[PDB]
Amino acid sequence: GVDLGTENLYFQSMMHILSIGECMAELAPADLPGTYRLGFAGDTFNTAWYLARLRPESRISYFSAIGDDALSQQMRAAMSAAGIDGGGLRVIPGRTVGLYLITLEQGERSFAYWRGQSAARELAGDADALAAAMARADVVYFSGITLAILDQCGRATLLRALAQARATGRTIAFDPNLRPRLWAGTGEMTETIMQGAAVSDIALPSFEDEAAWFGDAGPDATADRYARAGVRSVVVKNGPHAVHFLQDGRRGRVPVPPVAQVVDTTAAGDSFNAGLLDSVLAGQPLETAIAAAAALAGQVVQGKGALVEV
Template sequence: MRVLAIGECMAELAPAAEPDDYHLGFAGDTFNTAWYLARLRPDMDVSFFTAVGTDPLSYQMREAFATSGIDSSYVLSVPDSTVGLYMISLENGERSFSYWRGQSAARQLATNPQLLARAMTEVDLIYFSGITLAILDVTSREILLDALRVARASGKVIAFDPNLRPRLWSGTSEMTATIMQGATVSDIALPSYEDEAEWFGDDDPIATVDRYASAGATTIVVKNGADAVHFRHGDMSGVMPVPPLNHVIDTTAAGDSFNAGILAGIAENAPLNDSITLACRLAGAVVQGKGALVPIDPTLFDAVSVKGNENA
């Protein structure tokens, strides 16, 4: 299966071993998921659709895509532009983030509708997020949603993580309305209950499942931190416990890696229970490392039974 992730990748400045030293890396929600997919399934064709600048930092980002095994043939170059940047600060073991993304070329990723449409025709599964929508202006947002709508109608599988980030939106009403627009073009919804409860007022994860099902998603998997995962796939619904962890170091990419596990299983037509098991194992391994991109053991994929079980 060929997978296309759409969104923003940013330059990351993370504290290094020496005080006042920082390590340069690259991360971003949909990119993180693509990265873990490529690590988990090296035989899978994973592409990333974004826009970068023409400066040295943008070229370094392109090199990072290549060394990660992620196809960058759909990456746009925006002249006289650069990429977004964030810096991680540590104080008494607590992480805080400072962002500089107003100049990010990724805000222009939907300015070439023809390339966007062509990219979608050449893959099987398309993944985007609420952050993907949030960074775009209204016109670009509509271009992306229209392209996703057409792709879904043609038989492509669309996966969506709402990834609610209020600071990226002009207001709560714009955020919630646009997120539900994203849900209406999606087959798979991967929300996080904590965010959904805060911004949509969901009383429990079942309410979150019901809302995304009503929007048109046929597979919904609700993440809830260390608490149980609620899911629905067609007429089947259920709850799966999350294995306890003794030591959590960094939860930065917990949700992104979880999504990669779900998509890896779905790409193999595996039972959804197996995909959730894989997602929990992967996220569990990631939060016991440091940073967004943590080396993983591909044998985690052994959790998946590739049998094409149509009842899953």
């Protein structure tokens, strides 16, 4: 299946990025009326999918938990087909995966979801498995959805594993991705997101999504908030507006070219994150990485669905 390359004690033949979170089954409108196509999505998985297309010579791993039913097996097979390393997936017997259903009526999309009992909510049940997945990753990526789906013990287990990996030299990247409906309380949400910030080197907040919850006056305030948690590189997405960044005390802005013919903004942020991390792994300056990120996101906005072939 997926080529993992080779290694010695010191280096691996492939650059290695691990994404941790929930991959969702997804039913999306098909052509033939009343029908839907089964695919797979979910924020951190979307990011992994874009990364595997940007750098197919690298090792893009996904860590999560799935069930042992047919649908879970289809999910595993889809990861492999997409060039994603799912070797570390954990299997939770008696559970299945989460699901999105997208409906399309007179050209308007809406969605429903079922994920309150998904296997992925157990992804932090085995601390040793988490540590092993991270051990030789160049970058470890996770999101606020990754945090939201876990109970407090699982949140703590994940945060501890990230801190430990960070201390051994793993670069930790975080997409706060606030989704209020996935949290049982507001304070828990904002506090837990900032716990995620405290173990991360790179953070990719969105001003529009976060300002209300934290009281950020503007994107520079958002950046300051993450820097105070120890984040070394903060890259603040703000829709069609210039991307503000803050890195070790230094601010800058990167303009975002206007995007005509908007089709579907789904996964715009996930793909931005992939473009940024791809460029960072390639050793490009932060400003160059941000420009690349915006360029990819614009093409995803112009395309339909979570996984756009750009």
